[PDB]
Amino acid sequence: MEFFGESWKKHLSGEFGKPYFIKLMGFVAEERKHYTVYPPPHQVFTWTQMCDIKDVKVVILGQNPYHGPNQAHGLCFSVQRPVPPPPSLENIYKELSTDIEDFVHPGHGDLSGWAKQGVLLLNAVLTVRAHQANSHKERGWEQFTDAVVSWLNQNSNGLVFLLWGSYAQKKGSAIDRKRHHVLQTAHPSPRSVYRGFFGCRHFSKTNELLQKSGKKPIDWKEL
DNA sequence: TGGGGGCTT
DNA sequence: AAAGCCGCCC
Ligand SMILES: O=c1cc[nH]c(=O)[nH]1
């Protein structure tokens, strides 16, 4: 059907008519008529197409999409075949390997598996100019993504959130630490993986917390 | 073989 | 806000 999944549109609809958003889309479109922008128009909101807002249990949040051609497709750190898993997804794979013994490198970079399971693969800023990192930062995405988190926070229980990287962690000060389990760590990029990511064991810690709260855990190899 | 965050000034 | 300094696997 369309760009936004039913539940998501329904619950984020209140944002559409807000000036910050109007102008924002205005900005992005302009951008497009003058520069290559990722992810392409139809893919900016893939994260809403993967599962109903009502049954999202975990929220992995990154900063901006891959400013490289063929990478950014709507789900954070994910690349659709026949594109290979970029550094960030390789580092994520290294951890998963050690963290979850049942897990083995799946041979591709599509994260739709987790997504369909109830993992919101969000990103703070949803679009980026070709070959130019941080270009669409502070244009309105943050407030929109703030809106996403905000809602999820107010209307859910036991959401396990994974805030990877400083910019991502900024959102943490809007999550009720009592009802929701929050885990932080360095962004998986080569440039920042050694500062904590490697060894965090978020994935396992996640199934733990989720099982504890009486909810089916995640099958991290099912992707 | 160099392009892929985190913190300071 | 912009720019510099630093950091690092197979
Ligand atoms: O989608 C992606 C890729 C890299 N870094 C992020 O924060 N998100």
Q: Find the radius of gyration of the CA atoms of chain A.
A: 17
Count of domains observed in chain A: 1
CA distances from A162 to A22, A60, A82, A145, A159 (A): 29, 5, 27, 15, 10
CA A111–ligand 1 middle distance (angstroms): 12
CA A123–ligand 1 middle distance (angstroms): 7
CA A214–ligand 1 middle distance (angstroms): 30
CA pair distance A124, A160, nearest whole angstrom: 17
State whether the beta carbon of A70 lies below 7 angstroms from any atom of strand B: no
Residue–nucleotide distance: A23 CA to C1 C1' (Å): 21
A177, burial (CB in 10 Å: exposed 0-12, middle 13-18, buried 19+): exposed
In the chain, the amino acid numbered A26 is G
**Contact (CB, 8 A) for A50 and A112:** yes
Residue–nucleotide distance: A2 CA to C5 C1' (Å): 46
CA distances from A163 to A13, A20, A29, A48, A122 (A): 25, 24, 29, 19, 10
Of residues 120 to 179 in chain A, which lie within 7 A of strand B by their beta carbon? 131, 133, 165-167
CATH number for position A199: 3.40.470.10
Q: Identify the experimental approach.
A: X-ray
DSSP strand pairing (A128-129 vs A37-38)? antiparallel
| Domain boundaries, position A16 | 1-223
Sequence-distant (≥ 6) Cβ neighbours of residue A122 within 8 angstroms: A47, A59, A60, A61, A62, A76, A145, A148, A149
Alpha helices by DSSP H, chain A: 6-16, 19-34, 46-49, 87-99, 112-117, 141-154, 166-169, 190-193, 202-212
